[PDB]
Structures are given as C-alpha cells and as structure tokens.
Design a protein around this nucleic acid. Structure first.
Lengths: 61, 210, 662, 306
RNA sequence: ACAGGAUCAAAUCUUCCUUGAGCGACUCGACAGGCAAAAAAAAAAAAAAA
RNA sequence: UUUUUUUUUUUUUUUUUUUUUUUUUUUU
C-alpha cells in the first residue's frame, strides 16, 4: 500500500502487471526488485538492504 | 566620501587594465564556491539556503526582552491599522462628563440591535485595550457599562451634549508631581503597639503639627 | 588548477632550463588590490577569547634554539665533560637562562665550558642563544614602533651563530603588525634594512640587467665568494609583508621623496613582487617639466630599472592569463550549434619615456658607466623591429645621450682591479653597445618604412668595439683554465671560475648580436625601399633570402674582423659550454658574415675548432632553442656550407615546426 | 552591566529608541534558492509520526475573531530553526532529527563547538534539541523550518519549564488551611503544618510528603490551539497559556491520544513539511476558521421543580 | 578514508571484497576554567588592546 | 510598572516529560 502510492507512474503501471503480490515474491526469492522500488522498501523498513554507493573521491594527479 | 583618499591611477588604459583583473578574480571566486558547494552536496548533502523570514538570528543578534517588547508594540500598531479600516464611521471627540449614545449589535443571526445612552465617567487611555465607561439611570435605577474603543460590534457612536472647557483638558492630561516631597511617605510614620513610649502619641499613625 | 597541472605533468617537452645554479629566480607574483574585509575582523574576535586569562607581558610563545646536528651525550654530562659548547648548546643546556656579560665573565674564570668562540665575555649570551651584538638588544616584539628603525639599524651593524634567524623573524613579524603606525618614510627604510639582511653577500644572474648595488672589491684567485644559503633563488622578503604594506603607500604616495621612491622601487624589484595599482600610480606622478629633474643620476637609473623589470613581467603575465580566461566562461549548446552552422614590448607611457629620454640627454655627462648602462638597456627594451609607440624624436634624444656619454667616458680608472669586477665592467660595456645598436636600427626602420608612402652614432660606437676586443683578449689570458667537454680519482672543477667565464662569454655574445644588428641597420638605407624592408624582415624571421654581405658595415669592418678574431681565440681554448642560450644564433651568423671574399680565414674556421665547439653546443642544447633560432641556424649553416653529421641529424629529425613544412 | 539606577532609567528610556514598524505584504513568492533539492512529498502511513518545533515566548495579546469574541493568545517566534543532523538505525540505532535554535556571540563559543558549526555551514546556535519521529519523515539536513508546518485550527502539545519563586512556606506552596486568627491560638500555630504522621505504630514518614521548600522550576505541558500564523516574520499565535519566562525555550508538537482522536481527525496536514512549488504564490497570513453556530445565542433552559 | 586488495575490468558518478559496529555521533589538541570586580528571580548580556 | 485571586487557560502524554552516569577496564 505504501509503495504503490509512492512509486512513480511508470513503475506503478508495471507493479500492477505482476501475476501476484510483489512483496511476497521478493521475500520468497521469485522476483528481483528495481532500484526505485528498493528505495521505497528501504525507506519503509528504515534499514539499507544492499551496499549503496558513496559519491566521493579525490582525483589522483 | 566612502573611504580615505588614495593615490590611484586615473588613465583610461590603466583603469581598463585593472578592470580585467577584477573580473578575473570575481569569476574565479564564483567558480571555486560553486565547486565546493557541489562537492559538499554530493558527499554529505548539506545545504545552506537563504533566509525565509526576518529574525534576529538572521541579523546575528541575541534575543532580548527589549526586542520582544519592540515586536509586541509593532504587532499592536499593525492590529490598530488593520482594525481602523473595517469601520464605516469616524469616532467623534469626547471626554468626561459628556452625554453620548452608543449603538451596538446584540445578535447577528437574529438582527437584534441595541442603543445605550449615558454620561462619560471614565476614559481609559491605552493603545489597543482603551475603553470608555458610561453611566445613566432608568426609572431610578443606575446602570454602568464600559465599552472598548476598538470593537467590531460598535454600530455607531454619537455625542448628544459636550462640555468643552479647560477643566476637561486638565483631566485628559497626565500631570507631573510638583515637588519630590512625596518620597516622605507620611502614612508610614506610625508607632508600634509594643514599642517604647516616645512622647504622647498613641499607637498608630503620628501627627506633624508638633 | 587541476587540469593545468595535469597537462604540465603529462608534457614531455616542457623543462626547466638552467645553465647555472644562480640563473634560477623566484617565481613572479602579482598582488591584488586592497578592499574592506569585514570577515577577517569577525574572525579576529575568536582569537582573543581568553586574553584576560593569560600573561599580560609575555602571552606569545617562547622561541626555541635550533637543534644540534648530532645527538647529545647519553648522560648529558656537559658540565663534567668540560668541552666548549656553542651559544645555542649553552642556552639549551642551561635552561635557556640569561647570561649577562658579568655572569658570563665570572663563569668563564671558573669553568672551560663557557670558554667558547661565541661566548663573548663583553656581549653575553641571550635566552635563545643570541650573542655577538644581538644579545645586547631586547626582543623585537617588545620594542615600541618609534624605536624600530634604530633597533634594526643597530642590529644590522652586528653554520655559525644560527640564532639570528629568530631575531630577524621576530622583527619581520613586528613590522607587519605595526605597519599602520610607523612613518611612511621610515617604513621604506625598515624594508630596505630587512632586504639587506636577507640578501647580504649575493650574486646576480648572468642574463639579468637590474641589480640593487654595484659589485666592488672585497678585502681565492678570482676573489668571488659563493654560498648556497644566500642563493639568489631565495626570496628576501615574504610576500605577506609586501601585501600588508601595499595599502600604506597608496595613501601617502605624495609624501615620499625621490630617494624614498627609488628605494621603494628597488625593494619591489628585488622582491620580485609587482602591483598594478602602485606601478601606475608611480608612473602617472613623475614627469618632465620645461619633476623628474629632481632625481639624481644614481637614483634615476635605479628607478627606471625597477619599473621596467616589473612591467615586462606584468605584461607577460597579463598575456598568459588572457588565454586561460577563455575556458572559465560557460558556453550553451545553442551557441555550439550556431558555431557549427556558421563554420560550414609597449610597457611605458609616452610622456614618461619622453621625460626619461630628455633627462638622460640633459645630464649624460653626470652618469657613470653602471648607471648609464642600466638606464639605457632598460629603455631600449621597448624599441623593437617588427613595425603607445615611442617617437623618432624620443629615440634620437637617447641616441644623442649615448653619444655624449661615450664621448665623455674616461675608459677605466680603477687600475684593473679584481677579475670579477673587470668582467662585470666588460659586460656593462657590451650592454651599452647593444643599446647603441638597437637605437639606430629602430630609427632607420621607421624612417625607411614611412618614406615609401610619400646624428653621428657610428663615430662614438666605433670605440666600444675596440675596447671590448682589448679587454676580452686580456681577460682570456688572465683567467685560469678549466677542462673541456670535447677533450682520489676526481677532476678538480672550481664552481667559482665558471661564473666569470660565463660572464665573459655572455658579453661576447652581446657584442656578436649588436654587430649583427648593425648590418641590417645599415642595409636599410636606399632596389626599392619595400624590397629592402622585406629583405630585412626575411632575415629577422629566418626565411630564404639573399646572402648577407659584410661590406655594408663600411667603417666598422675592421672592428668586426677584430671582434670575430677575439671570439675565435676565446672559443678555441675555452670551448662553447658557457655560451648563453638566448643569443646562440647570433654567434653563428657572425661567422657566416665573416665568411666572404676570404683569403686565409677559411682554414682557421675549419670550413678542436671554434666552429666545431659551437656545433657541439648547438647539438647539446637543441632541446632548448626556439623555432626562430633553429630556422636561423638552419639557414646560416647552409650559407656557409657547414656539413656536420650530428648537427644535420638534429636539424631535420627533431622538430615539427620546421621539418614538417616547406 | 551598569548600575541599578542606570538600568532603571534605561528601562524607562528605551521606549524612545524604537525602530519603525516593517511593511507587511499580502503575498509571497519563493524561488529555487529557498528550497531543499532533496525535499519531496511522501504519502503518510498508519505508523508515521511528524517532527516538533522550538519557539521562544514573547508575550500575551488579545485578539478578536469573525464572530467578535475576544480571546487571549500568546505569541511565539521560531528563531531560525534548522536541522543539523539525522539518526539512523544502522548508524546510531534509532531514528531522530537534531535541530538548532538561537544565536551566540563568537567570543563565547568553544573551539570544539565551532568545529561542528563549520561542518554544518550555519551560524552559531544557542540551543540544540532532538525529536523522535518515524523513519519516513526524516527531513534533509540544512532545511529551515517554517511556521507553515502547523495548519490553523488544530490542537498542539506544548512543553516547557515553569517559573521560579524561591523559598516558600507550606501555606504558600501547597496552600494549607492553617489555624484561626483568634480564639486563643498560639503564635506558631497560625501557619503551622499540624499533624505530619501517625503514632509509634508508624515510626517513619511516608515518602513524597508535602513540606516546605523551594517552589517552581518544574516541567509542565499543556494543550494549545493554532489561532494565527505569519510567514513574513515567522510568528505563531497560540490560544491558551504557555509556561516559562518571556523568552524561554518551548517545544511544540502535534496532538496525542484523545486530543488527536477528538480534534485532529478531519484536518488535512502536510505530513513531512511545507513544500512550495516554484512559480506559485502563497498567502502570508492565515486565520482560524469561524465556528458554525452563533456564539451569542442564549436558548431557553426550562426550570421545573419536582 | 574511496584508504587497501582481486579480475580477459564497472555509463557519466567504483562490478565485487576487507575495515568485528572506520573508537556511540560530531569536533578540538595553546583543548578546557575554579576564584575576584561588576552584574544578577532561572536564564541571558563584555573581542583584544594596564 | 510589580504581586495576588475575586480574572484567564488546560485537564493531554506514562516506552511521555525529565535526568547527577558511555560500561570489552577481571585486581587506579
């Protein structure tokens, strides 16, 4: 309910194309979530799920 | 008259030359600030925006009671200004001992009005909480009512009989003490019940004739 | 700037050329303009939050004596050892305890540790190891503004004695803090004293024109002294001081006497620091009145020299930043698309220069060799040969001045003292010659170019060539010999002799340049004028042209032959490893000019030998020469029919701006 | 830091040195220079909670309304409330947001404290507080709070410290009855506490006994109503009363429990924050909606004896 | 900290691993402030310069 | 201008408000 109402329209439309629930499939290992979806998921659970990037680094001469 | 005089060049070519340098330095500083801002934002996400409101903090000043008071006064100023506009009538000049007839609404829904008449007894002079007290008698029964000056309910205000005279102006003015004798406080000069006998003064306030 | 450093790091052709260690100089810096700085004042509030809670007399840190080279004794039994200790060691061992002259004298009669060379009983030892005069003065920090000048002057009169650095550092700092309280005139004297302390006993570059003081005999066969600690590469004055002091002068520029202005310009020049604001302000004040006349001959030269030295670099830097300015600007994609669619020396005021010229002209006889040379060489920088711009009148004035000076010159009066001084005098004479040469060329070119559309210099010029020929011949024999490139176990090479050798070679190159230029100058004379001009331009640019002839010299032919013989003799016995980089082509050109209608000079010139040595140098230094020089050489060699397997290899396989075009 | 008599004259003479009142506008337009790039609209959930705010007590005032009923309202000013840092379960172990308020002279701030401010890119702060909220309402660092967070006509939870009255007696603190002024009463008995325990059966005084001591200086909480707000000056008018001195720090949050259930049910509120759209104007001043029924209506109440 | 390491090797902008949880978080290293004068309901208000 | 009820406001939170104490330191 939270994710569905948060995701943009493009993602929302695809969310409705899955044969069943996306959460259950992700939990069960029968579906690979997108970056966008993952973002929302992590926002809900209040904990990162995967090693995120770190946009920082000193250019070496 | 901005700064002390300096022995700077005045040739057009020299000034144009200087301008270039100025421009260059400006550009450089802009670019560097942009770069650092970007970097910071990218890394940490720290943002430093412009002020959104007028606050002492903006001005880099502490919070003081003085400031508080200032603000409070300003708010009353603005409120007065705003309220003045809504009215459809001009308040006439009056004073103590002047017969007046006030007209005010009772019930907006019911359209019930009210008209009071009485002689001025008191005019409490303030900023926003100013009021006037009216007294009258009906069939031998005396009634008294105080009405604020600034009220949206006041339909109308008129004066039936005035008493223009210097006596009213005297009452309508804040007088100053004649002398600093008031500090004497004669009312405090008393004698204790249990205190030693000092003259022929009974317990209580003393006398100044002797 | 990150991209700009990466390009320099990735560059395979850019290098730091240096014939000698002393040639290198501190980098040029351009100071900005002053402006109100409210933020710095607010920051200063955070530096004095606990001053009420600190010492009221000595709140600043305490100086530390320099450390020793080797570690101290294990047990630190310095007193028991009985060996003499330096001032810093005694200071550091006695807990940095003051040793007034009486106490030191009493202790020296009881222990031998205090009987050291720096432990002067009549001066004492300071807290920080100060001695020999500095120990008798109080801390610079504690001295009032009004007593700074006297303290510095008294101190100036005072790997040994390493403790003076602390005192001078303190002084430097003090000056900066008390800048805004001292007299404007006293400030200049303080800066000059600091510069003297920081640059005492130094040697100027070989290719440099400007110099603070004149070299003189000092009471080694050559008599010259060198030291890496006092290398000219070292900046006397920190930029901070100058930056801070900049504003002061702007406010009270009208209160500075001509002697103070000359010293200020010299200090700036010595420091290598520049300021547009200041430069322009000084330029726009002084002028000729029918006042520059107040300046004395000694101060005038220095003031001119400094200004020129600074201005040259200023302009140079301006030019450099102009091009870098392009990339900082943003370009939109629409501009890109539109562009795609579509694609389908003068660094002197006229008035100032005129005034200078007039000044020189009017008091030619009052000048000395050094001053005159210095002044002349500076002003000749603007005169070029490509063709605001100075006037013929202005140039004629300077020419006349030169002539007058030459006529009135005695020609040496010190009885031929130290060899370094004699070499410096020879180089100054060569400079003079150079100047003389350039003036004529400018005048002639101007006249000849202007005529198409619609002073006896040589008589005075002739003497300098003879004097140089005699002096170079004498000094070559008087100087000691050294090994040659072309031909305990270690070759004895004293660095102190190569300096004077390079000075002599630079003077010779100067003369060779001058005599070369004179040829063009003369040849410009009335073939059409336009054709003549074209010919001269070809010659200067290094292009295919007519063979150069020597007869055009006329009266100067004998002097040119004598000069060629002198340089041939010098190079036949001293190689070509000390020649300047910026005047290499001229030395080649002069021999090509000499090779004409010859009778016997063909055998001495090969066509070890001077020519061979020159070639050997060319080949060696091919990685440093400019495209102009390279083309000039390429043509010159051809002219003379000089065949060299080595030189021809570099002339056609190691450059793209000459070989990859026809 | 002057004398008593200098301060007293100052107190009186201050009135003569008041700057002129500002000019208040009717409309406000915001640009991209006042908006956090990282700020976005987030849909709420069943277990989502918002953040609080800090304010300074200025003073009381009386204001009318649409029906003409006068009400007493306290004025509060948010002194540039800015987020400093955030807390995460992974990092710290709990979700929270740290905010700052006030201004301090640079000649009073310690170096370690200044190190934080340099990082933060914000002027020195007087006070720092923290709020616990849900993970889905974590505001970006550097975002400046505004008075628009609370909509007029909603219930608010206000917390702050009470005033100080020094030492007080039993009769003064608690409000004891005491004894009569007459009828043969001892001097000491006038204001005595009386019995303070039981007989030998209970040889110990029960904890938390009402006795004499220093009064005041305690935490207190109260409900308030949003009456009016100002965007220009960042001002909020709260209906009711707020403890603490005229300048003391006060915390404001949303309703909790019954207060929320009964009042704050049908009131649409911007959960995360106020998110203005570039290129659109907003009101400066917002007033509380009037009631439905006529307040000035006195119906008849039958009084029948039985 | 993009600090270290592997690979027939990554969109601009690190594919993946190590740092026990990069010392609870930030920051400082001449850091920090007890007492005195003056002021002083809690609290706040003084840049240094005899 | 201050104090007070004789005036005004609330009657909500309790994993809340608040606080004197960072703890891999098993012989300071």
């Amino acid at each position: 309910k939270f994710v569905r109402l948060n995701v943009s329209e493009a993602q929302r439309q695809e969310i409705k194309n899955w044969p069943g629930s996306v959460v259950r499939c992700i939990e069960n290992g029968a579906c690979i979530p997108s970056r966008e979806l993952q973002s929302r998921l992590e926002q809900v659970v209040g904990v990162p799920l995967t090693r995120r990037k770190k946009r920082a680094g000193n250019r070496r001469l | 008259l901005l700064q002390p005089p300096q022995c700077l060049p005045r040739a057009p070519s020299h000034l144009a030359k200087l301008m270039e340098e100025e421009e260059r330095l400006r550009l450089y500083r802009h670019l560097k600030k942009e770069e650092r801002d970007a970097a910071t934002l990218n890394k940490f996400g720290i943002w430093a925006g412009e002020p959104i409101a007028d606050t002492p903090a903006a001005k880099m000043q502490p919070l003081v009671a003085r400031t508080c008071r200032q603000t409070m006064r300003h708010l009353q100023q603005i409120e007065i200004e705003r309220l003045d506009k809504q009215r459809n009538f001009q308040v006439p000049l009056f004073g103590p001992g002047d017969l007046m007839e006030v007209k005010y609404e009772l019930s907006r829904s019911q359209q019930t009005f009210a008209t009071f008449q009485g002689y001025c007894v008191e005019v409490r002079k303030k900023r926003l909480n100013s009021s006037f007290v009216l007294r009258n008698s009906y069939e031998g029964i005396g009634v008294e009512q105080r009405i604020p000056l600034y009220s949206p309910r006041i339909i109308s205000l008129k004066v039936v009989s005035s008493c223009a005279s210097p006596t009213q102006d005297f009452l309508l003015e804040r007088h100053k003490p004649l002398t600093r004798d008031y500090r004497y406080k004669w009312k405090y000069n008393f004698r204790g019940r249990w205190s030693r006998r000092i003259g022929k003064h009974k317990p209580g306030i003393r006398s100044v004739e002797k | 700037s990150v991209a700009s450093r990466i390009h320099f790091l990735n560059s395979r052709t850019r290098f730091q050329t240096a014939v000698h260690a002393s040639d290198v100089a501190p980098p040029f810096l351009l100071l900005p303009l002053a402006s109100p700085r409210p933020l710095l004042a607010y920051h200063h509030r955070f530096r004095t939050r606990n001053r009420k809670r600190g010492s009221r007399f000595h709140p600043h840190p305490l100086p530390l004596p320099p450390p020793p080279l080797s570690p101290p004794r294990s047990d630190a039994a310095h007193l028991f050892a009985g060996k003499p200790l330096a001032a810093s060691a005694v200071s550091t061992a006695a807990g940095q305890q003051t040793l007034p002259p009486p106490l030191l004298r009493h202790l020296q009669g009881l222990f031998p540790v205090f009987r050291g060379p720096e432990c002067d009983p009549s001066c004492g030892v300071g807290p920080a190891g100060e001695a020999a005069g500095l120990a008798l003065l109080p801390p610079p920090s504690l001295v009032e503004p009004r007593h700074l000048e006297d303290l510095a002057r008294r101190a100036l009169q005072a790997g040994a004695c390493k403790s003076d650095r602390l005192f001078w550092r303190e002084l430097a700092a003090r000056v900066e803090k008390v800048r805004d309280l001292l007299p404007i005139e006293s400030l200049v004297r303080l800066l000059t004293i600091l510069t003297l302390n920081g640059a005492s006993g130094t040697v100027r570059p070989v290719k440099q024109i400007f110099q603070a003081f004149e070299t003189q005999d000092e009471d080694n066969r050559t008599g010259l002294r060198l030291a890496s600690e006092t290398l000219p590469c070292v900046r006397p004055l920190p930029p901070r001081l100058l930056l801070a002091s900049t504003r002061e002068f702007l406010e009270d520029l009208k209160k500075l006497s001509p002697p103070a202005t000359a010293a200020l310009a010299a200090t700036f020049a010595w420091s290598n620091c520049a300021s547009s604001a200041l430069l322009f302000a000084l330029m726009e004040r002084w002028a000729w009145r029918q006042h520059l006349g107040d300046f004395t001959p000694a101060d005038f030269a220095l003031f001119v020299s400094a200004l020129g030295h600074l201005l040259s670099q200023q302009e140079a830097t301006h030019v450099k930043y102009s091009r870098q300015a392009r990339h900082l600007r943003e370009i939109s994609g629409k501009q890109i698309m539109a562009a795609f669619r579509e694609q389908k020396a003068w660094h002197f005021t006229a008035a100032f220069f005129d005034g200078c010229c007039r000044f020189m002209a009017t008091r030619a006889e009052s000048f000395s060799l050094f001053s005159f040379a210095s002044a002349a060489r500076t002003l000749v920088e603007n005169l070029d040969a490509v063709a605001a711009c100075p006037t013929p009148d202005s140039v004629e004035a300077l020419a006349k001045a030169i002539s007058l000076f030459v006529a009135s010159w005695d020609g040496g009066d010190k009885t031929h003292g130290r060899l370094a001084t004699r070499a410096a005098n020879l180089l100054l004479v060569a400079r003079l010659l150079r100047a003389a040469s350039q003036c004529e060329l400018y005048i002639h070119l101007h006249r000849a170019l202007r005529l198409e559309a619609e002073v006896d210099t040589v008589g005075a010029c002739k003497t300098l060539l003879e004097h140089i020929s005699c002096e170079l011949g004498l000094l070559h024999s008087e100087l000691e010999a050294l090994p040659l490139l072309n031909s305990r176990g270690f070759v004895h090479i004293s660095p102190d002799t190569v300096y004077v050798r390079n000075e002599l070679l630079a003077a010779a190159g100067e003369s060779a340049a001058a005599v070369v230029r004179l040829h063009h100058a003369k040849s410009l004379l009335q073939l059409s004028t336009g054709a003549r001009v074209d010919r001269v331009k070809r010659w200067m640019r290094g292009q295919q042209a007519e063979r150069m002839q020597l007869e055009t010299l006329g009266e100067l032919k004998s002097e040119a032959e004598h000069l060629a013989d002198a340089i041939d003799r010098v190079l036949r016995e001293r190689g070509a490893a000390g020649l300047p980089t910026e005047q290499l082509a001229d030395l080649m050109e002069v021999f090509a000019l000499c090779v004409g209608d010859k009778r016997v000079s063909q055998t001495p010139e090969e066509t070890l030998s001077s020519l061979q040595a020159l070639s050997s140098e060319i080949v060696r230094r091919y990685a440093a020469l400019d495209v102009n020089q390279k083309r000039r050489i390429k043509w010159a060699t051809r002219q003379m029919d000089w065949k060299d397997p080595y030189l021809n290899h570099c002339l056609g396989r190691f450059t793209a701006a000459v070989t990859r075009q026809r | 830091y002057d004398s008593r008599w200098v301060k007293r004259l100052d107190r009186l003479r201050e009135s003569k040195f008041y700057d002129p009142a500002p000019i208040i506008k009717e409309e406000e337009i915001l640009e991209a220079d006042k908006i956090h790039p990282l700020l976005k609209k987030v849909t709420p959930s069943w277990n989502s909670r918002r953040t609080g705010l800090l304010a300074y007590k200025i003073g009381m005032m009386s204001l009318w309304d649409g029906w003409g009923e006068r009400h007493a309202v306290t004025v509060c000013q948010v002194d540039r409330c800015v987020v400093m840092d955030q807390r995460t379960l992974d990092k710290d172990g709990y979700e929270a947001c740290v905010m700052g308020i006030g201004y301090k002279p640079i000649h009073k701030v310690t170096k370690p404290m200044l190190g934080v401010y340099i990082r933060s890119q914000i002027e020195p702060k007087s006070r720092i507080a923290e709020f616990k909220c849900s993970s889905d309402c974590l505001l970006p660092v550097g975002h400046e709070m505004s008075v628009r967070h609370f909509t007029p006509g909603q219930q608010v939870f206000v917390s702050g410290w009470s005033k100080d009255k020094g030492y007080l007696g039993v009769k003064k603190r608690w409000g004891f009855a005491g004894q009569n002024a007459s009828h043969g009463v001892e001097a000491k008995a006038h204001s005595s506490p009386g019995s303070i325990g039981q007989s030998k059966t209970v040889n110990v005084v029960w904890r938390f006994k009402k006795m004499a001591g220093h009064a005041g200086g305690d935490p207190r909480v109260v409900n308030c109503k949003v009456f009016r707000i100002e965007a220009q000056r960042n001002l909020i008018f709260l209906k009711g009363c707020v403890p603490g001195y005229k300048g003391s720090l006060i915390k404001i949050s949303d309703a909790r429990g019954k207060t929320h259930h009964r009042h704050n049910r049908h009131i649409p509120l911007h959960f995360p924050t106020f998110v203005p759209e570039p290129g659109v104007s907003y009101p400066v001043t917002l007033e509380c909606p009037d009631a439905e029924q006529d307040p000035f209506l006195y119906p008849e109440i039958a009084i029948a004896d039985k």
